[PDB]
Each structure stands twice: as C-alpha cells, then as structure tokens.
Design a protein around this ligand. Sequence first.
Ligand SMILES: Nc1ncnc2c1ncn2[C@@H]1O[C@H](COP(=O)(O)OP(=O)(O)NP(=O)(O)O)[C@@H](O)[C@H]1O
Ligand SMILES: Nc1ncnc2c1ncn2[C@@H]1O[C@H](COP(=O)(O)OP(=O)(O)NP(=O)(O)O)[C@@H](O)[C@H]1O
Ligand SMILES: Nc1ncnc2c1ncn2[C@@H]1O[C@H](COP(=O)(O)OP(=O)(O)NP(=O)(O)O)[C@@H](O)[C@H]1O
Ligand SMILES: [Mg+2]
Ligand SMILES: [Mg+2]
Ligand SMILES: [Mg+2]
Lengths: 315, 315, 315
Amino acid sequence: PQPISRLEQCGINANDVKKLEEAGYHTVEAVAYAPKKELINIKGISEAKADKILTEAAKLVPMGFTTATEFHQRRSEIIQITTGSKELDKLLQGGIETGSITEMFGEFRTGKTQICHTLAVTCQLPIDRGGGEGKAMYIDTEGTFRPERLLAVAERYGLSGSDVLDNVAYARGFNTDHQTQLLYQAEDMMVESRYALLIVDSATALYRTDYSGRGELSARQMHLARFLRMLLRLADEFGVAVVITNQVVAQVDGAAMFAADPKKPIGGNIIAHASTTRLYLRKGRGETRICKIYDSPCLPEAEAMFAINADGVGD
Amino acid sequence: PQPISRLEQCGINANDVKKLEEAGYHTVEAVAYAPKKELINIKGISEAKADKILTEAAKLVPMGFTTATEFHQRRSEIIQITTGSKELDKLLQGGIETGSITEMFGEFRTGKTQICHTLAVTCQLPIDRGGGEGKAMYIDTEGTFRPERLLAVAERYGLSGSDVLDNVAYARGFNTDHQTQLLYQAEDMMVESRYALLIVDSATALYRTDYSGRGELSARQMHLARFLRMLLRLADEFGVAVVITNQVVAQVDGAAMFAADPKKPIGGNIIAHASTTRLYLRKGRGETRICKIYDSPCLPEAEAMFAINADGVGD
Amino acid sequence: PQPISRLEQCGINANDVKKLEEAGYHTVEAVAYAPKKELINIKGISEAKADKILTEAAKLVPMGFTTATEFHQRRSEIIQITTGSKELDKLLQGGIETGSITEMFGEFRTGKTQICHTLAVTCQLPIDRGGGEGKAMYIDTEGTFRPERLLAVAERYGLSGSDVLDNVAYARGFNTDHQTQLLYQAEDMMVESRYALLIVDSATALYRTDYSGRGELSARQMHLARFLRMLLRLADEFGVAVVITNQVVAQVDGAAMFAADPKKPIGGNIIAHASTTRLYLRKGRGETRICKIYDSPCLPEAEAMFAINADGVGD
DNA sequence: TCAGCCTATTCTTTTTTTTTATTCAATTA
DNA sequence: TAATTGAATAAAAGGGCGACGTAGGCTGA
Ligand SMILES: Nc1ncnc2c1ncn2[C@@H]1O[C@H](COP(=O)(O)OP(=O)(O)NP(=O)(O)O)[C@@H](O)[C@H]1O
Ligand SMILES: Nc1ncnc2c1ncn2[C@@H]1O[C@H](COP(=O)(O)OP(=O)(O)NP(=O)(O)O)[C@@H](O)[C@H]1O
Ligand SMILES: Nc1ncnc2c1ncn2[C@@H]1O[C@H](COP(=O)(O)OP(=O)(O)NP(=O)(O)O)[C@@H](O)[C@H]1O
Ligand SMILES: [Mg+2]
Ligand SMILES: [Mg+2]
Ligand SMILES: [Mg+2]
C-alpha cells in the first residue's frame, strides 16, 4: 500500500499532484504500468510534463527485463489466503491466489454466497491459519448481503463478534457504470489502509441486466474488458485476492447424451483470456458440492469436495 | 422512495423531470438505478443534460462503502411479514422478508395461488400481527383472482371486509410486454401510498407461451431479464416485499434412476441468479400440502407442512 | 366484445385492419391481448401504425390498473350456468362460472361426452334456471356428437329442441392444426353473435395420436401451449364458458394404489396449469358417477353422486 | 438462387439409483 | 402402574425405458 506522496519531486507543483488523484490514479503502480494512450487526453496536463511523470515512475518500479528466478519467487511469494476447506487447499495447492484471477462457476444453491462469506471472516486470521491478517470488502449487486452468515462463521473460527463487524464493507452496485464509481473509491480506501480481499458475486449479472442484446453488441463486450482492466490494476497494485462468482448459461446440446454440457458460461472469450484460473461448482447429493479447476495450465485438473454445512464451507 | 419533485435544483429545467417520469423511471431511486447511455437515447435529451441528471441525483442518494455493522441494522429494519401458519414462519424465521425475491413453485392443486391470497390479507395487519400496515399489489395473468377468498381470511383475523376491499388491487397482463406496461403502475401508485407487497402470480407463464424461436435470448430470456431487474429495482427502490411465481416442467431425460420424477422448474439460470430464495410446493394427503425451501443463503434447507383450510393456510 | 370497426378512426389505414382479421384478430381485445413483436412480424403493416393500434387498443378496452372492489362487482357479474344435475351445482356452488377453463377428464364411459351434450342444451335457458340464453359451440374430434341426445335433454326442460337445433353449431377437427384453425373462424362467430359455451370435447385426444413422445414431444407441448392461449383469450373477450375434455393415461410404476388407480391426466403440466376448475370423473355403480374436484381456486375437494339418465344428466 | 444438403475439421478426461419404524423408555400413569 | 411412541434400519438389487436443429450449405433449380 503506497500513495502518490512519493511522486512529489522534480519541479512538480502542488496543483498537478491533485490532478492525478482526481483522474483515478491513486497509486504509484497506476502510473508506470498503464498504457500511454489513456494518460495524455486529460485537459490540463501538457505533453512535456506528461513525459515527466512517466520517467520518474520508471526508475522506482522497474519495467525492464528482470531475471526469471525472480519471477519464480514472485510465483511462490503468494500469501495464499485459504478458503477454510483443506480439500481446496489440496486442489488449489494451498488456497486462493492473491493477485491472480480466480473464477468460480455457479447456477443455484452451489454455495456461492456461502463461500464468499466464509472468506470474508478469513481475512482477519493469521498466516498460520491461512488468512492474510487484513481488511477486506464485499460489494454486492444482487441484494444478498448477509450479517447472519457473516456473524455465525466467525464463531466457527472463534473470533469475537464486533471485530468482523468492523470488517468487510458493502455498497449496493446499482449499475454497470456504478461498477466504475466504486472502483475509483475502492482504490481510495487502499490509500487509507491495507486490504486483502475483494468479492463480488454478481458482477457479470449487471452485464446481463443493462445491455439488451443485440444492437449494442460491442457495448456489452467492451464494458467487460473495461472492468477486467481495472481489477488487475489493483491485483498488480498490492496483490489483492479476487473472488468473483460468475454465472453460467445452459447451452442447448439436448438431442442425446454425447458431451451434453449445458455450459460454456457468460463473460465471453475476453474473460477467458483474463481468467488464468477457473473453477467449476455443481450440486452433488444432499448439500455437499464439488470443485474442479478449468482453463489453467497453472493449476492441475483435479476434483475435491467442499461441504456447505451449518458451520460453514467445511466438511 | 423519493420522487423527482426534489431534483429541480441547480439549473435542472422543468422538462426533464416529467419526461423522465413517463418514459419509465418515476423515482430518483430509479435514476441512480438508471444507466448513463440509456438516458441519452430518450428523445429530447442531449449528452450534456444527461450528466446533469445523474450527477445531481448522486448528491441526493449516497452510494459510499458502509461497514458491516450497519447493514446488520439495515436488515434489522425489515418488517418481515407473516405467512399465516407459524410452522412456515419458524422455517422462514418469522415469515417472508421484505426487499427480496421469494418463489413458490409446485405441480398443480398445490396452492401456488392459495399462498398468495393469505399473503394478500397480511399487508393491512398491524406490526404486532405481522403486517406492514400497507397495501399489497396482486398481478396475475391466468385469472386466479378469487376475492371471495379475500373475504375469508380477513374473517380469519377478525377484521372487516370493506376496508380490505378498499385495499389490494389487481391487474391481468395479457402479454409479456404487458407486464412491463403495468409495471410502471407500481412506482406511480407507490409514491402516492406506501405498499407492503407486490404479487405477480404468473411470472413465466406468459414466457412459457412466447419463446424466442428455438430457446434463444430473445423474448423468452432477455425480456425475462428485463422483467426481473425491475423486480430487483422495486426491491431496492422501496424495500417493498414481493412474491414471484414460476411454473414447473418435467424431465424426460432422467430414466428410472434415484428419483423417477424430478422437475427442475422453468426459466433457466436467469431466474435462478435473480432468485434470492424459493419454496417448493408438493402435495401431501387431502388438504395437507408440503413446503420445502429451496436456495436460501440465510436459512437451512428444511421442510415444513401447511394445509389449505377454508379460512386459508393452517395446520 | 368490440370489433375493429371501433378501431377504424383517427386516420388509421383501412388496409391493415383487415390484416388483423386475416391474422384472426377480429376484435380490439385480441390485439390488446397480443404481444407487440408478433403483430410487427405480420407482413404489410406499418410498424408505427401497429404501435398506434397498441395505444388505441389501450384506449378502447380497460387495460388500466383497478382495485378489487369493482372486480368483486364484476366477478359477481358472471352468469354461472347450472349443469342439469341438482347435486352438481351445489358441489360447484351454483354451477359453472362462465369465462373460464373447466376441465373434465376421466376414463371411458364416465360421462365426459355426456355432460358436454347436456351443457349445450342448458345454455339456451334464461339465467333464472341457471341458463345462459346464448349460442353455444361444439368442437368435436371424436365424432361422438349426438344431436338425438340433446333432444332428450330438450324434453327434460320443456324446451323445443328444434329451436335448440338452430343453435348449437357443430364442427369437427381432424388435425392438430385443423383444431387451432377452427378457433379463428369461431372467433368471428363470437363477434357476430353472443355465445356462452365453446366446448372442445376431445381437446387433447388428438395430440396424443399425432406425436410420438421423447422427441416430437416439445413440438407437441409447445403447440399444445399455443392452443390454450387462443383458448383463454376466447374466454375473456366474449365471456364464454370454456369446457375442455381431457383424456387420461394410466401411470405405470410402483405407484399403483387404490381409489386413484393412478391416472395422471394426459397433457403433462400445460393442460394442468391452464385449469380454472379441473374436475375428475369416476364411475361408481351402474349410472351413478362420482365427480371429485381437483385444482380449483374457490372449491374444496368434495364429490357428488350423479346419474346419467335416459334424458341427460339426472339425479 | 435459398432451401435441401452435409454431415468440414474438431477436442479433451473424468462422477454416485429404498424400506416396511422395533430400539429405548414409553409420555403417560 | 406406569405402554404407547417422540427415536431408529441396509446388502442384497425392477411389473422400464424411449429427445428438436440454424451453422460446410455442391448438384436438382
Ligand atoms: N442457517 C443455515 N443453516 C444451514 N445451511 C444454511 C443456512 N443458511 C443457508 N444455508 C445453506 O446455504 C446454501 C445456499 O447456497 P448458495 O449458492 O449461496 O445460494 P445463493 O448463492 O444465495 N443463491 P444465489 O443468490 O442465486 O447466488 C443452501 O444450500 C444451504 O445449505
Ligand atoms: N374452499 C376450499 N376448501 C379447500 N381447499 C380449497 C378451497 N378452495 C380452493 N381450495 C384449494 O386451493 C387450491 C387452488 O389451486 P392452486 O394450487 O392455488 O392453483 P395453481 O397451482 O396455480 N394451479 P393453476 O391455478 O391451474 O395454475 C386447490 O388445491 C384447491 O383444492
Ligand atoms: N339413453 C341412455 N340412457 C342411459 N345412459 C345412457 C344413454 N346413452 C348413453 N348413456 C350412458 O352414457 C355414458 C357415455 O359415457 P361417456 O363417458 O360420455 O362417453 P366416453 O367415455 O367419452 N366415450 P369415449 O370418447 O370413448 O371416452 C355411458 O355410461 C352410457 O351408459
Ligand atoms: Mg451461492
Ligand atoms: Mg396454486
Ligand atoms: Mg364421454
């Protein structure tokens, strides 16, 4: 967590340093690793001083070629905030990945609001219990924010009641353009304090409910690539873990029985380029559920069980 | 629940208040739930005036991140009206909740419309007697409005019939779009008098008879999702309770394995992610039927038992 | 009961108003009962003028939001035709509520084709003796229409059957699509003269023979669903008691018990959800038949003995 | 011409078919 | 003297088994 108070040097004034705050660029990681075509069209920053803010951002955080052994250390330095389920820690090799896109499939009753509200108390746990010891936030868009589920699974982990009440924040995401106004604000709390998890269970559901296909046909598409350009900028900012429940379409293959999958879910191929690690969830018998990793040479294809019981997502 | 009679501040002219009204969004809650580019496509609106509506309405309603010890109270203000027999109410922890989506689905003669008529008398009850002291809004397309039942359950709770008849009102949608034609009625009446409940007793029955051509996103699915976000909108506009009713299909693929008669009710995944909770209907013996809850994030998957008696639901 | 001549105003063209009548829409309620896109799909129509109908269909008939009091005045304004038997009316609490689908399924020889003969006679009475005093319709797809049987009921009620033979009009179906076509001719007759009873006394006897099952079933069921939409709209325009005779299969599994003999009325769910007053017909001893009630919004699960005499239904 | 025709290459590896209701202490003497 | 049940059973295996079609679109036209 680093603000842009470092970026006040080399002839810069106090007026222009606020014009990076009001543009949405609240971190020093936002300045160097952004493409140049979005930074230059702001009214009131000239071309020579725009080349001044990129050259001071180059030497602090390096964009040059770094050793591949440092990348393997960048692969293993993940905190791996565990889901509470030890089978998934044997499936995803020790929990969720902080800073990589981790997508979970779901249609109905598969525990999607139950997995998000067990992880939302996990962010206070120490690193031996798996959690990252940090604040977090659950932004909901389907009107399914639960205090009772949040308060009960804290008793499973044995914490108090009032500390997790000061934990995960919530705002109702009304619109697809309201996904952006929280995102500039969610980086602004990242200036205020450290955060370790961000969860939205129905981010793609707003895409299902704003753009009446077709006629807009690209407007439903580029707003997904927009939203998947913002969150990876926060994922490259600190290394925050992302947890998104994505919905699934029932593909019509129902003649007869050969590879009959009501599948190939929504979001398109442009989330498929961004989802380096995908998961499939589905109903089993009773209330027990099953996870399988998809669309990932990073994680091996296997299956395990996570059981939504009265205590939480456990066994 | 606030109207646009207060937005007429800081240069907003009188033309854009009432043309926003008739076009479909009567409340400033709906303006925050309206998108950016959708406001531009109304004839009589420019792009510069489209900023002056959404930004100035953002001065009215706040959308910041609020901590988890405040929605615990925001859920606690829910009136959570009763269901007429406490075995369902203890299954539902008091009864159905306001500001959510609740669904009853079952085969036939199972009381999909009879659980409506007992909820239709609840809205004029006091808060000690479950009711939010308001009015309910009954919509049905099949023709299951039988107001002699509404005389009956008012005598179940003692109160007179005429004042109840001055209350809850009716509409019958003949078309899929005719639902959204009569949907504007909601807000319209809503701001004139506080309503406790909305009933659409045939959500997807009209959609069952107007498919796309072969199953596709058109009127069968997209206009269904256009419908449900407005049902989401009314849940977020006023917090008014609403019950929804989906018909049921059979399964022709499941040869005589574990259960020879499974159902999987219609609508696919678009209804399912808009679905907050469901309660499955199936008959027992005679007047005894059975409610089984489906897909609640806050309540377990338990089962209860009611009976359609002459006074209404009972035991 | 208002035709397209009540629509021919306001500079609306005379070339499209016959295209409605070519598409079966002979009255302004039907286009008000029709969704927007399908009328746009009609060839040779102006799209805006089609919308100009859709605001003037909204003007001519009440599609506006009303309160249950005037409904309860208008729902009391139903002719409520008696069924010839004294015991059957008090079972149904005053006979057959006009404007509704009342289904009568049973085995062979129970009286399904018998009662539909007697109902066509008792329409011609004045309303004091539970008559309707209107024309009535007979759609047969079995050939079991027998006008000699009507004259026996005519002598029972002191009415000259020669006068009753100038009314009820015969028709005969042969196909699935010859059936649904026969509504569109009949709709006109409903404009040009008052009716009370449109019987389809083997309405689902024909869909079983002309579609196999497990494949070509969805082509049956959707087309069965396309049938009832035209059928419910005939009830609501002209105020006509709609009587459907369903046949019945025998269910074949370990559900074989007594007094249910498990029958499972054919037509799945789409013939079930379109019930207002679903019946059931068992044979007792001899001519004493036993009419159990299913699936009705206002009636209890009772039964009433009735004997099919030499002169119609008797007691 | 489209509409009937033609069946272009594909492509990736693993999940769950019952029950007549006694034990006991009984839920009441 | 309470006495009927709130509770609980399983390794064998049935009076059971069957789906639309727009996707490469030649030739007839
Ligand atoms: N009090 C409770 N006790 C036990 N289990 C519970 C309780 N409340 C909820 N559950 C479980 O929560 C599960 C709900 O799964 P879930 O997939 O989160 O539903 P959902 O996500 O809210 N539906 P949706 O809004 O469409 O995402 C149920 O299957 C229950 O087993
Ligand atoms: N006076 C009454 N006494 C007892 N039961 C009644 C009485 N009136 C109606 N019922 C029952 O109420 C139920 C009404 O049917 P219901 O199941 O609500 O409609 P439904 O599920 O929508 N089927 P459908 O109306 O065709 O779509 C039936 O089970 C009737 O037996
Ligand atoms: N003149 C009569 N006197 C007495 N009973 C009669 C007379 N004519 C017919 N019936 C009875 O009417 C009943 C006809 O049964 P009904 O159920 O109407 O026919 P149905 O079953 O529909 N024929 P089907 O199409 O094969 O089902 C029989 O039980 C006859 O005994
Ligand atoms: Mg869930
Ligand atoms: Mg019902
Ligand atoms: Mg008969």
